[PDB]
Design a protein around this motif. Sequence first.
Motif, PDB file in Angstrom:
ATOM      1  N   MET A   1       0.827  -1.201   0.000  1.00 46.12           N
ATOM      2  CA  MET A   1       0.000   0.000   0.000  1.00 46.12           C
ATOM      3  C   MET A   1       0.865   1.256   0.000  1.00 46.12           C
ATOM      4  O   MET A   1       0.460   2.301  -0.506  1.00 46.12           O
ATOM      5  N   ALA A   2       2.059   1.147   0.574  1.00 44.84           N
ATOM      6  CA  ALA A   2       2.983   2.272   0.638  1.00 44.84           C
ATOM      7  C   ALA A   2       2.466   3.352   1.584  1.00 44.84           C
ATOM      8  O   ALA A   2       2.939   3.478   2.714  1.00 44.84           O
ATOM      9  N   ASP A   3       1.495   4.127   1.116  1.00 41.32           N
ATOM     10  CA  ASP A   3       0.914   5.196   1.920  1.00 41.32           C
ATOM     11  C   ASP A   3      -0.581   5.332   1.645  1.00 41.32           C
ATOM     12  O   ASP A   3      -0.991   6.065   0.746  1.00 41.32           O
ATOM     13  N   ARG A   4      -1.388   4.620   2.424  1.00 42.27           N
ATOM     14  CA  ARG A   4      -2.837   4.660   2.263  1.00 42.27           C
ATOM     15  C   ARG A   4      -3.483   5.496   3.363  1.00 42.27           C
ATOM     16  O   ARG A   4      -4.390   5.034   4.058  1.00 42.27           O
ATOM     17  N   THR A   5      -3.011   6.729   3.517  1.00 46.42           N
ATOM     18  CA  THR A   5      -3.542   7.630   4.532  1.00 46.42           C
ATOM     19  C   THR A   5      -3.507   9.078   4.056  1.00 46.42           C
ATOM     20  O   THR A   5      -2.833   9.403   3.078  1.00 46.42           O
ATOM     21  N   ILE A   6      -4.235   9.943   4.754  1.00 47.21           N
ATOM     22  CA  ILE A   6      -4.285  11.356   4.402  1.00 47.21           C
ATOM     23  C   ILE A   6      -3.868  12.230   5.581  1.00 47.21           C
ATOM     24  O   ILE A   6      -4.314  12.023   6.708  1.00 47.21           O
ATOM     25  N   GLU A   7      -3.011  13.209   5.310  1.00 49.25           N
ATOM     26  CA  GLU A   7      -2.535  14.117   6.347  1.00 49.25           C
ATOM     27  C   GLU A   7      -3.387  15.381   6.399  1.00 49.25           C
ATOM     28  O   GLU A   7      -3.750  15.941   5.364  1.00 49.25           O
ATOM     29  N   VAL A   8      -3.705  15.825   7.611  1.00 52.44           N
ATOM     30  CA  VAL A   8      -4.515  17.023   7.799  1.00 52.44           C
ATOM     31  C   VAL A   8      -3.904  17.940   8.852  1.00 52.44           C
ATOM     32  O   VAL A   8      -3.677  17.527   9.990  1.00 52.44           O
ATOM     33  N   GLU A   9      -3.641  19.184   8.467  1.00 53.62           N
ATOM     34  CA  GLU A   9      -3.056  20.159   9.380  1.00 53.62           C
ATOM     35  C   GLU A   9      -4.142  20.889  10.164  1.00 53.62           C
ATOM     36  O   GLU A   9      -4.912  21.671   9.601  1.00 53.62           O
ATOM     37  N   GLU A  67     -10.331   8.614  -0.851  1.00 51.30           N
ATOM     38  CA  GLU A  67      -9.758   7.767  -1.891  1.00 51.30           C
ATOM     39  C   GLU A  67      -9.499   8.569  -3.163  1.00 51.30           C
ATOM     40  O   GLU A  67      -8.617   8.233  -3.953  1.00 51.30           O
ATOM     41  N   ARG A  68     -10.275   9.631  -3.354  1.00 50.66           N
ATOM     42  CA  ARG A  68     -10.130  10.481  -4.531  1.00 50.66           C
ATOM     43  C   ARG A  68      -8.814  11.250  -4.488  1.00 50.66           C
ATOM     44  O   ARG A  68      -8.338  11.745  -5.511  1.00 50.66           O
ATOM     45  N   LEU A  69      -8.231  11.349  -3.299  1.00 48.08           N
ATOM     46  CA  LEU A  69      -6.970  12.059  -3.121  1.00 48.08           C
ATOM     47  C   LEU A  69      -6.124  11.405  -2.033  1.00 48.08           C
ATOM     48  O   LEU A  69      -5.480  12.091  -1.239  1.00 48.08           O
ATOM     49  N   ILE A  70      -6.130  10.077  -2.005  1.00 48.66           N
ATOM     50  CA  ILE A  70      -5.361   9.331  -1.016  1.00 48.66           C
ATOM     51  C   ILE A  70      -3.880   9.683  -1.092  1.00 48.66           C
ATOM     52  O   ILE A  70      -3.262   9.587  -2.152  1.00 48.66           O
ATOM     53  N   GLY A  71      -3.315  10.089   0.040  1.00 47.29           N
ATOM     54  CA  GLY A  71      -1.909  10.448   0.081  1.00 47.29           C
ATOM     55  C   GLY A  71      -1.688  11.943  -0.034  1.00 47.29           C
ATOM     56  O   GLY A  71      -0.591  12.439   0.227  1.00 47.29           O
ATOM     57  N   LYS A  72      -2.731  12.666  -0.426  1.00 49.27           N
ATOM     58  CA  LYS A  72      -2.648  14.113  -0.575  1.00 49.27           C
ATOM     59  C   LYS A  72      -2.769  14.808   0.778  1.00 49.27           C
ATOM     60  O   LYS A  72      -3.482  14.341   1.665  1.00 49.27           O
ATOM     61  N   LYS A  73      -2.066  15.926   0.928  1.00 49.84           N
ATOM     62  CA  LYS A  73      -2.095  16.687   2.171  1.00 49.84           C
ATOM     63  C   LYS A  73      -3.137  17.800   2.102  1.00 49.84           C
ATOM     64  O   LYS A  73      -3.317  18.431   1.061  1.00 49.84           O
ATOM     65  N   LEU A  74      -3.817  18.036   3.219  1.00 50.53           N
ATOM     66  CA  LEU A  74      -4.839  19.074   3.286  1.00 50.53           C
ATOM     67  C   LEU A  74      -4.744  19.848   4.598  1.00 50.53           C
ATOM     68  O   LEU A  74      -4.124  19.389   5.558  1.00 50.53           O
ATOM     69  N   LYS A  75      -5.365  21.022   4.633  1.00 46.43           N
ATOM     70  CA  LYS A  75      -5.353  21.859   5.826  1.00 46.43           C
ATOM     71  C   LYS A  75      -6.774  22.209   6.259  1.00 46.43           C
ATOM     72  O   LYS A  75      -7.597  22.624   5.443  1.00 46.43           O
ATOM     73  N   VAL A  76      -7.055  22.039   7.547  1.00 45.16           N
ATOM     74  CA  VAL A  76      -8.375  22.339   8.088  1.00 45.16           C
ATOM     75  C   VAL A  76      -8.316  23.508   9.066  1.00 45.16           C
ATOM     76  O   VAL A  76      -7.656  23.431  10.103  1.00 45.16           O
ATOM     77  N   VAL A  77      -9.009  24.590   8.728  1.00 45.64           N
ATOM     78  CA  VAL A  77      -9.038  25.775   9.576  1.00 45.64           C
ATOM     79  C   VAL A  77     -10.468  26.248   9.813  1.00 45.64           C
ATOM     80  O   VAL A  77     -11.345  26.103   8.961  1.00 45.64           O
ATOM     81  N   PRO A  78     -10.710  26.828  10.997  1.00 49.56           N
ATOM     82  CA  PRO A  78     -12.034  27.336  11.373  1.00 49.56           C
ATOM     83  C   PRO A  78     -12.428  28.574  10.575  1.00 49.56           C
ATOM     84  O   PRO A  78     -11.570  29.310  10.087  1.00 49.56           O
ATOM     85  N   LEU A  79     -13.731  28.799  10.446  1.00 46.01           N
ATOM     86  CA  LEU A  79     -14.239  29.949   9.707  1.00 46.01           C
ATOM     87  C   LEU A  79     -15.231  30.743  10.551  1.00 46.01           C
ATOM     88  O   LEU A  79     -15.155  30.746  11.779  1.00 46.01           O
TER      89      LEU A  79
END
Length: 79
Positions: A1-9, A67-79
């Motif tokens: 799988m190598a990297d089957r996870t998503i990173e979220v800041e 799954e549409r962006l598995i392995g891609k990094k994203l950032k979550v911030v309040p609004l």
Amino acid sequence: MADRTIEVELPNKQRTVINVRPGLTLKEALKKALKVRGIDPNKVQVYLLLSGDDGAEQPLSLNHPAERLIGKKLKVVPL
């Protein structure tokens, strides 16, 4: 799988990695993440960073499967 996870800041100069399978949306994948953190889906937003093709950090739909962006990094911030 190598990297089957998503990173979220997360906010507050903090970052955390989460894992999810191909089926549920990012919301259901972050449900537990925001559940313990006490974060609401209607009080925060997640964007995806690329470089200069996606406009650099763009908004995403809650019905978007990791799954549409598995392995891609994203950032979550309040609004």
